[PDB]
Structures are given as structure tokens and as C-alpha cells.
């Protein structure tokens, strides 16, 4: 366990679950959240073959396993899965008896109430945690970057949200939420690589496609002369190696796969795109406090790591927003670990001590108290 009764901070966030003790500056446990099942008949005896594979063992044997992503779009689908993944993160990675430290979990905004009610119920009644608290993934990014106050434009593999935070207060009348996330870029890439001739259908290929998206994708400055010029010459075409030893060439689809985050008509959703989401989020605040947000709008979340996101977002705001207005985008380079670093501070480095949910209050109140306390 731990050499101190400091609390435990872990984001589950539907992608790569991040976990570690409070008061650190580095997360001590990171793995891709995934639940594996053997799909084929076994004949060889004695190599374990246990029907519950999870995490970093799961990407090792990922050729003969089905894949089950447990958390989708910010909603939790199957509770046996999260019951499994909590137990695996606690007992195998940080080897911690969970009844020694309180915990801090998180969510996106606007998630359904039964989900938070289940999550609050489970750690108390199955793990007997002393205390629990739920934070907001919009908030802690600012405690990560230091208190600059503004728009937190964070998009992970689950969702995308737009929360303005001013001066110590949040604005619940004008937050936003979209579903173009990491998964939809994967699934657009699946239909996109099929144009070249390649073909991927099964879910074991999904984490391979995720790798190519993680490497060879960059957000073009213009979306017309790029898609004309790379169609005019192969200067953009690079290569990659599938784990068999093949060589796959990539055309203009290095940029068209995250292009649709600024043009979400391609995948058939109807919405604004994330830049107009940011702008319409700002226009629903007051005319008094506006000009801070234009200079203190902060990115976060691992889907915003494509090399060109900053200049593209800046040019799009500058064309969109009123003219004589200084616009300034922070893009801190630990952003893929931003949120947990936020959970680094807020658990340990505050007066956050009576603000915990004492389990006594849970035994007196039931689950729904986590509605009326933590936000």
C-alpha cells in the first residue's frame, strides 16, 4: 500500500485509465482500459488461459481476444467491466488496500445521474473506501496549468466539452458537449483507409488503426490547397509497418482523418465543429467578461495533440471572432496527462478535507447525496 494515508486519484475516462497517489507529479499507473475475452477453443493445457484479460496483458495477446471497451461516450455500459477494471487497477498496479485512502473520480459534464449514482455506490459498498469525491474534467485542467481562467476545451476519447470558467465561478448555462471523440476519428479512418485498398473489419485491428492515427496525423492549415496539393504530388505520402512485416502507404489521409473535427458533416452528425462550438460557447456569456477568455482558452486531452492544432484553432477564431481582439491559446505539453495532474493538487493541496463524502453520510443518506454535494 502507501507510506502515508494520502488519498488516491484515478481518472477512468474511457480511454487510458490514469492512476496514482495524491501529492505526486507523475502518474504511477497507466494502461489502455480494455476487457478481453478468449474467442477460440483452447486445447493446450496449463498456460493460464483465464477468461478475464484486462489492460496491459490485453494488448499483448490481442490477436485471439475479443475486445470490449467498457466505457463509451462518457457513459458506462457494463458494470461487471468497471467492477473488473477497478479491482485490477487497485490490486495489481498500486497494490493498495482500498480501505486505507479516499478516492477521487471524475466525469465529463452532463453525464446521466444513474451513472454517478452507480459509481458512488460501488466503491463504498464493494470496496469500503473511507471517502469519495467526484470532480469535473473541465475544472482540474486549470489547476494543472496554474490558475489562468478561461474556456477549457478538452476532448478525450469519450467526449468533447466546452466549459467557461471565470474568476472562481463556472457558467452552467452555457457549457457544451459533443461526441466527436477519439473513437469517431478511428471509425472515420476505418472507412477512409478502405478507399486506398486496405481493409480492416475486426476489432483486433482497432488498436492497430489507433496507432497509425496516433502517429501519422496532422491538422492542415488550409483544407483545400492541402487536399489539392497532396492530390497533385506524393510529397505527403509516407509509410508504416503493420506487425506482420507489410508496408502500407498513406495518401492524403494523414490530414483528412482529423480534418473532420473542423468539418463534422463527413461522418454525418450535425453540429458546428469544435471551433464554432467554442465561439458559440463564448457568445452565451456576458459582454463584460469576454476578453479574458479569448486570451486564456486552454486545450487539454489527448485528442488535441495533432501537430497543427494550435495555429489552426487560432486562425479559425481570428477569422470568426471580432477583429481587434487579442486571441491567445495556451497549449501546455503535458496535456495528455493534464487531468490527473489536476487531481494531483486538489486532493492533497487544499482545505479539501471536510468536503469529502464521509462514508457515514452515505450510510445515513444513500447514493443521491453525491448529487447535492460535489457540484
Amino acid at each position: 500500500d502507501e507510506d502515508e494515508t494520502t488519498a488516491l486519484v484515478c481518472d477512468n475516462g474511457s480511454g487510458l485509465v490514469k492512476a496514482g497517489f495524491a501529492g505526486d507529479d507523475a502518474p504511477r499507473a497507466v494502461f489502455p482500459s480494455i476487457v478481453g475475452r478468449p474467442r477460440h477453443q483452447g486445447v493446450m493445457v496449463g498456460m493460464g488461459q483465464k477468461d478475464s484479460y484486462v489492460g496491459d496483458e490485453a494488448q499483448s495477446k490481442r490477436g485471439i481476444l475479443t475486445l470490449k471497451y467498457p466505457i463509451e461516450h462518457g457513459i458506462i455500459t457494463n458494470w461487471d467491466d468497471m467492477e473488473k477494471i477497478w479491482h485490477h487497477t487497485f490490486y495489481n498496479e498500486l497494490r493498495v488496500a482500498p480501505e486505507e485512502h479516499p478516492t477521487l473520480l471524475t466525469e465529463a459534464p452532463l453525464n446521466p445521474k444513474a451513472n454517478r449514482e452507480k459509481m458512488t455506490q460501488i466503491m463504498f459498498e464493494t470496496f469500503n473506501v473511507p471517502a469519495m469525491y467526484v470532480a469535473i474534467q473541465a475544472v482540474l485542467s486549470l489547476y494543472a496549468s496554474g490558475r489562468t481562467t478561461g474556456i477549457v476545451l478538452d476532448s478525450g476519447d469519450g467526449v468533447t466539452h466546452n466549459v467557461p470558467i471565470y474568476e472562481g465561478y463556472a457558467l452552467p448555462h452555457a457549457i457544451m458537449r459533443l461526441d466527436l471523440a477519439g473513437r469517431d476519428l478511428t471509425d472515420y479512418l476505418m472507412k477512409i483507409l478502405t478507399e486506398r485498398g486496405y481493409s480492416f473489419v475486426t476489432t483486433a485491428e482497432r488498436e492497430i488503426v489507433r496507432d497509425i492515427k496516433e502517429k501519422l496525423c496532422y491538422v492542415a492549415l488550409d483544407f483545400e490547397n492541402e487536399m489539392a496539393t497532396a492530390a497533385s504530388s506524393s510529397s505527403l505520402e509516407k509509410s508504416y509497418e503493420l506487425p506482420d512485416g507489410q508496408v502500407i502507404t498513406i495518401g492524403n489521409e494523414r490530414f483528412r482523418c482529423p480534418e473532420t473535427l473542423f468539418q463534422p458533416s463527413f461522418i454525418g452528425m450535425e453540429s458546428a465543429g469544435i471551433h464554432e462550438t467554442t465561439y458559440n460557447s463564448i457568445m452565451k456569456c456576458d459582454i463584460d467578461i469576454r476578453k479574458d477568455l479569448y486570451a486564456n482558452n486552454v486545450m487539454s486531452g489527448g485528442t488535441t495533440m495533432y501537430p497543427g492544432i494550435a495555429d489552426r484553432m487560432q486562425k479559425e477564431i481570428t477569422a470568426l471572432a471580432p477583429s481587434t481582439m487579442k486571441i491567445k491559446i495556451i497549449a501546455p505539453p503535458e496535456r495528455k496527462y493534464s487531468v490527473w495532474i489536476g487531481g494531483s493538487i486538489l486532493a492533497s493541496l487544499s482545505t479539501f478535507q471536510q468536503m469529502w463524502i464521509t462514508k457515514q453520510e452515505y450510510d445515513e443518506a444513500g447514493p443521491s447525496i453525491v448529487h447535492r454535494k460535489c457540484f
Partner: protein, 680 residues
């Protein structure tokens, strides 16, 4: 209500008799003073069999009292118990004391063990020929001096120097055997046995049955017990010219002897000890050529430990970079270099009827083959020394009555319970099963003697879950040892996933790999390190042919007569030793020791509790209290009834008592309830 014991940190059961407090909130004063708010009632003694309370408080109080009374208080219990006083025994091992032990039957048998030795000699004279006495005691309990005093008492009794030859033989045995364990910098060697054959009382024959050697100490070692004392003595360099004649390097040079940084030890002068061992071998009658061959054999074992194995498909063959250790090993063993290399890397014994195939084994197999050759060679070397030991000992002229004596390593703890320690725990478990069977037989004999109809197996359950089933833990370990690519953690997952419930044993905590098992000496979690690498063993025929037909004459005599699981052969050997011990009349003796100060008038209640737990003295007390512990005669029960408030009158005043023939076989808790009724 006020007279009781009190559990505390230092005084684990302090007989605190101050105030009758509440049932669980027990707030009173004590010997240390006023205490706060559940230990049992409290009431130097020779026997606590008639005590009002049969508890660890009264037992520890009698222990500390006899430590203060300087008496080696041996309770009768069909088994005695003494303490190493770390002092001289005047008029206790004396010949007049031996004459009194030969004379006084009932009186002197209380604290004295030579009187118990005379009783055992009379029982052997009472046509109970097959008889032996168990000697419970740890490293530094004085069991060797106790056995010497018992041999002196037997020579005073049986008449008929074997004791001096036994004294001269223990230096040759322990040097080949002992190392620097966590409990002793001069540890034990192995299980040792002795048998004195009597020619109608004339004790004339010498025999030994020392088995269950520490074969795993050849290559796998992780603590200061790595260097065998013979191995360290050869590493000490008992001859400087023969070192260059044997190409013997430094003590750090041998990689097989490079285990856990215990090269220099502040416990032995192994050059002078090696000279003393050579003198003892000459006293046994070893030839100088025989001594040179033994030294050359140990040197060849060291060079073979230094013989590195290496990795076309390179994973089935080896190479040679420091081939000097290979060539010196070939020279010191007097066999061909290419022939020994082929016997290493080839393993080619696959024949059908006239065909023959050469299965060129892998590097991980190759290192195991080297380890197997070494473990064969050293075991053959210990066996030849045992043969010479039994030769220089000399037995009787086909005698039929012998008395046995046994000294084996018992239950123990460490920072981690290794598979060697696990096998030692299994040995102590089988020994405790036999001792508990003897105690239960004595209890049933005492019940049938007083005609008491008095209406353990979980130890047999632990033995079954460990080894005895076809799906046992030793069996599953052997099973996973065979099928390749068996990960150690994967072994642990099945280990905790088969027999998961239903034991005094389960999986570890939030850790990597360990198996917690509550043996009779308490709960130990053996840490699942490379037991799957330790228990591997192999015996091939061509290695036996190369050992038999090599040019070294003594080595040819060490393997002249030329299934694969160390747990399997260990189970067979331990079962054989238990079956051999089953044929004799049992006695038991417990050697305590004041190991705190290693001096007189000192006591370590933690170490004494560990001694009573490991030897099962507390367990024997529990098994005795399980039956009818209180037993007082009808006159004794009448006196107790007169003290409280004639057998029918005592039954009317009283109404688990069971009046037998003349005694009242009752419970000690009933005796304590009667004492509380007498006090109130």
C-alpha cells in the same frame, strides 16, 4: 474473579491477581502495577499435570520459575522437556547421579534426563528392543551434549570408544554439511540418525541412517548459508602447492559459490578447520590419496560450477570463452574433454530398438543438465563418505536389538520461506504428525487404562493439500515443472486457484506471488520465488556411464554401480524415514535454550513460545487438554470437595468429570470452575 493471568506485550501472559473486574473489560492491577480494561485464571513445579489451569500462563510461569529455581523441570507427559542452562551440570551428569538414576526409579525421574535414559534402557531391557527417543531442540539447544550425556548414561547402564569415535565423526560430517544459516552461523548438516546395537545388553554395534541431504544448496543459494563448510574449507586453500596443482582460484572466482556475498565469515578458521578435518579423516582412516581425490573432486565440482554454458540455431548448443574452467574440470575428473562436453550438450539417450537419436538440448535445459551432474556428484561424494563412516564405525555381529537416536532440522522461519524451507516444513509436519500420533496413542492408552470412555486430522489435511493427493500442491508444482514456458506467477495463479477454499491456506495479499499456509507451528507465507526452478532435476544414463568408466579411480568407485522431481524423491525418502521410525518404541525429549543471553538465569518468553510452538509442546498441551486433562483420585477428589464444600457425596455436592477406576478423569476447565467455586 481476581486471580487470573493477563496478556501483555512483554509478559504475554502475566499472572495478574488483583481485582475481579468485568468479563471482557478486565481492569485491575498487575505485577507491573495498575492496568486497563481476556487471559485465563492463574493458580518451578516438576509436572503441571495436576495443575488447576492447563494454560500457557501457568506453563510459562513454571518455565520462568524453574529458570529462576535453576531446575531443568521435565514434565512427565509421556515426554520430557529440559532447558540448555549454558552452565555446568554438577551432580546431574555425575556417576553417583548416574548410580542414583540406575537406582532411584520414581524419585529422581522428575527433572533428570539421565534417569529417563535409564528408564528407556530398562524398557529396552524389558524386551522393547526397537526403541528410540525424540530430541526436540533447535540450533544451540545443547542436543549434542544431551545425546553425549545420554550415551554416557547408557554406557553406565548397558556396559559393554564408540562415543569418542562419534565425537571424531561429527567434525567430518558437519564440515561436509553445515553452513551459515539465518538461525546459526554454524548450522546443522542434515537429518542424522544413530543406532546402538546391543548384544543382549552389551551395546556393541554402531549404525547410522542419515538421510535427506540439502541437495538444493549445490547451486541455488540466496543468503549467508551459501558456502558449505567443506566448500569454504576448500576455498580456504588447505594446501598452496595443491592449489596450483588444482588451478583453484579465489573464493569470489567460483560463480556457483558467488551467491549472496558471504565469502569471508567471522565464524570459522577454515584452514585450521581443514587441517583438523584432514586429521579427522586420518582418524577415520582415509588414505592420503583418498583425501587428495576428495579435494580434487570438490575442486572439479567448483570448476564445473565455473563451467559456463552458452548459446545457426544457437539455442541448442554452447561455446567456450573461459574454457580454462572446463579443461581443468575435465583434468580434475580424469575424463576426456570432448566426451564430457558431448555429455553436457548432447543428452543423447533416445533409442528405440536399434536406432539412436541425439536430442541436442537447449541452453536453459543445458544449465539444468550441468546442475544435475553436479547434484549427482556431490550426493555420491556424501554417500561415499557415509560408507567410509559406517565402515570405520563397525556394527555388531548380527545383533537383533538396537536403540535409536534421531536429530533432524525442524520447523523454522526466515524472511522468506524457500522451497528448501518448504521441504523442511513438510518434514517437520510429518514428524509432528508422528509425534501427535504417538501422543494420541498415549492418551488412548491412559483413557483405556483408567477405563475412560473418551469419545489433528487437519494436519493430515495439510499434508494432503501439500503433497499427498494426485492433485496436490507438490504434485501441481511437479506438473507445472514439466510443461514448458510455465511462468512463476502463472504457477502461483493455479496454486491459489486450486484448493483455493477449504484449508488453513490461501493466496497472498496484494503482492506478486506467495502462498500463505498455516502449518502447526503457525502461519507462514512462502514467497513464490523460483521453486519452479529449484525443484527441477534429471538423471540421464550416459552421465552415469561417464561417471562409472572415467579414469579417476576413486571417482569410478564413487559411481560404480551404473522420478525426475526433487519433491517426488523427497516425498519417497521422507516416507521411507517415517516408515523406518514407525517400527520403534517412541520417546520424546525437548531441549529448550536460554538463547537471549546465551547464559544462565535468562529467559526469552518469545523464543520459549516459539520453541513450544515449533516442537508442538503447546500443541501437545492442547491435545492433552482436548481429552480428560484433570485426573484426581477418589481421595484426592474427596479432599478437593472438602476444600470446596466419598465419591457419591462429591457427586452429590458437584451435581467434564468421568470417575474412572480410581481417578476422576475430568476437564481442567472443570477443575478451574471447582477452584472458583471453592474461592467463592
Amino acid at each position: 474473579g481476581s486471580p487470573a493471568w493477563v496478556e501483555d506485550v512483554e509478559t504475554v501472559w502475566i499472572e495478574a491477581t488483583v481485582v475481579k473486574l468485568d468479563g471482557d473489560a478486565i481492569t485491575a492491577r498487575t505485577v507491573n502495577g495498575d492496568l486497563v480494561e481476556a487471559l485465563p485464571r492463574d493458580e518451578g513445579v516438576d509436572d503441571m499435570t495436576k495443575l488447576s489451569y492447563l494454560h500457557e500462563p501457568g506453563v510459562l510461569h513454571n518455565l520462568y520459575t524453574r529458570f529462576k529455581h535453576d531446575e531443568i523441570y521435565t514434565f512427565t507427559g509421556n515426554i520430557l522437556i529440559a532447558v540448555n542452562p549454558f552452565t555446568r551440570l554438577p551432580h546431574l551428569f555425575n556417576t553417583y547421579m548416574m548410580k542414583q538414576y540406575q537406582d532411584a526409579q520414581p524419585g529422581d525421574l522428575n527433572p533428570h534426563v539421565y534417569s529417563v535414559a535409564d528408564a528407556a534402557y530398562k524398557a529396552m531391557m524389558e524386551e522393547m528392543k526397537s526403541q528410540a527417543i525424540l530430541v526436540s531442540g533447535e540450533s544451540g539447544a545443547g542436543k549434542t551434549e544431551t545425546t553425549k550425556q545420554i550415551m554416557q548414561y547408557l554406557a553406565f547402564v548397558g556396559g559393554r570408544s564408540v562415543e569418542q569415535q562419534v565425537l571424531q565423526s561429527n567434525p567430518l560430517l558437519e564440515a561436509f554439511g553445515n553452513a551459515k544459516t539465518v538461525r546459526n552461523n554454524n548450522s546443522s548438516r542434515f537429518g542424522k540418525f544413530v543406532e546402538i546395537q546391543f548384544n543382549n545388553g552389551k551395546i556393541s554395534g554402531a549404525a547410522v541412517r542419515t538421510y535427506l541431504l540439502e541437495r538444493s544448496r549445490v547451486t541455488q543459494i540466496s543468503s549467508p548459508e551459501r558456502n558449505y563448510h567443506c566448500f569454504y574449507q576448500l576455498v580456504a586453500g588447505a594446501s598452496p602447492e595443491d592449489a596450483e596443482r588444482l588451478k583453484l582460484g579465489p573464493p569470489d572466482s567460483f560463480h556457483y559459490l558467488n551467491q549472496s556475498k558471504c565469502v569471508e565469515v567471522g565464524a570459522i578458521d577454515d584452514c585450521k578447520e581443514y587441517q583438523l578435518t584432514r586429521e579427522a579423516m586420518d582418524i577415520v582412516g582415509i588414505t592420503t590419496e583418498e583425501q587428495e581425490a576428495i579435494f580434487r573432486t570438490i575442486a572439479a565440482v567448483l570448476h564445473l560450477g565455473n563451467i559456463e554454458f552458452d548459446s545457426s540455431d544457437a539455442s541448442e548448443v554452447s561455446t567456450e570463452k573461459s574454457k580454462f574452467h572446463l579443461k581443468a574440470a575435465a583434468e580434475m575428473l580424469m575424463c576426456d574433454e570432448q566426451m564430457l562436453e558431448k555429455s553436457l550438450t548432447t543428452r543423447i539417450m533416445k533409442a528405440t530398438r536399434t536406432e539412436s537419436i541425439t536430442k541436442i538440448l537447449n541452453k536453459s535445459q543445458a544449465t539444468d543438465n550441468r546442475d544435475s551432474i553436479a547434484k549427482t556428484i556431490y550426493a555420491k561424494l556424501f554417500d561415499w563418505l557415509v560408507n567410509k563412516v559406517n565402515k570405520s564405525i563397525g556394527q555388531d555381529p548380527h545383533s537383533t536389538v538396537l536403540i535409536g537416536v534421531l536429530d533432524i532440522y525442524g520447523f523454522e522461519s526466515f524472511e522468506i520461506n524457500s522451497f528448501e524451507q518448504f521441504c523442511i516444513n513438510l518434514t517437520n509436519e510429518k514428524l509432528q504428525q508422528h509425534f501427535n500420533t504417538h501422543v494420541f496413542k498415549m492418551e488412548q492408552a491412559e483413557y483405556r487404562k483408567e477405563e475412560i470412555n473418551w469419545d489433528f486430522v487437519d494436519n493430515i489435511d495439510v499434508l494432503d493439500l501439500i503433497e499427498k493427493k494426485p492433485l496436490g500442491i507438490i504434485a501441481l508444482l511437479d506438473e507445472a515443472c514439466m510443461l514448458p514456458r510455465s511462468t512463476a506467477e502463472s504457477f502461483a495463479r493455479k496454486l491459489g486457484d486450486t484448493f483455493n477454499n477449504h484449508r488453513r491456506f490461501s493466496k497472498h495479499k496484494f503482492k506478486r506471488t506467495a502462498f500463505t499456509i498455516d502449518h502447526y507451528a503457525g502461519q507462514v507465507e512462502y514467497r513464490a520465488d523460483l521453486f519452479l526452478e529449484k525443484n527441477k532435476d534429471f538423471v540421464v544414463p550416459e552421465h552415469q556411464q561417464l561417471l562409472h568408466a572415467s579414469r579417476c579411480a576413486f571417482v569410478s568407485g564413487l559411481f560404480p554401480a551404473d522420478f525426475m522431481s526433487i519433491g517426488s524423491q523427497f516425498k519417497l525418502q521422507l516416507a521411507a524415514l517415517m516408515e523406518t521410525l514407525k517400527l520403534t518404541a517412541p520417546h520424546y525429549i525437548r531441549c529448550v535454550k536460554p538463547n537471549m543471553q546465551l547464559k544462565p538465569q535468562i529467559f526469552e518468553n518469545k523464543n520459549v513460545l516459539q520453541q513450544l510452538r515449533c516442537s508442538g509442546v503447546l500443541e501437545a498441551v492442547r491435545i492433552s487438554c482436548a481429552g480428560f486433562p484433570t485426573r484426581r483420585t477418589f481421595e484426592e477428589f474427596l479432599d478437593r470437595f472438602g476444600l470446596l464444600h466419598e465419591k457419591v457425596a462429591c457427586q452429590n455436592l458437584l451435581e467434564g468429570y468421568q470417575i474412572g477406576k480410581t481417578k476422576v478423569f475430568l476437564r481442567a476447565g472443570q477443575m478451574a470452575i471447582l477452584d472458583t467455586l471453592r474461592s467463592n
